């Protein structure tokens, strides 16, 4: 769920607030359209697409499904007791959190005008 995804980010990017990723580029946060503006935005596009796929699973709601995972000693893991929906969503989140950690953050791309620039 979104609370858990926030914690994943806090565990892989303890250097910045999670809010920095909540409204960035064309894909991070609300936006789900147009040309990804940079590497970090591409991380979010993959994540958005990954949720759309998970939603194909009967009764699977990515924002709300509680999965089982661990974040310790520099390692993020989705545990074995996840059902198909939990496992998929956990993986989407995990991969995005790792992606965020290796992507440059451009303050210029925070809070951009979605209507004008993400067409």
């Amino acid at each position: 769920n979104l609370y858990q995804f926030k914690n994943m980010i806090q565990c892989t990017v303890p250097s910045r607030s999670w809010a920095d990723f909540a409204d960035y580029g064309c894909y991070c946060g609300k936006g789900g359209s147009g040309t990804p503006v940079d590497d970090l935005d591409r991380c979010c596009q993959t994540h958005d697409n990954c949720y759309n796929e998970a939603e194909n699973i009967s009764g699977c709601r990515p924002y709300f499904k509680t999965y089982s995972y661990e974040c310790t000693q520099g390692t993020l893991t989705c545990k074995g007791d996840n059902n198909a929906c939990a496992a998929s969503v956990c993986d989407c989140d995990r991969l995005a959190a790792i992606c965020f950690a290796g992507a440059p953050y451009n303050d210029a791309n925070y809070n951009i005008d979605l209507k004008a620039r993400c067409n």
């Binding site: 991070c28 946060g29 609300k30 924002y63």
Partner: peptide
């Protein structure tokens, strides 16, 4: 459309 990070 809700959030991230």
């Amino acid at each position: 459309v809700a959030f991230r990070s």
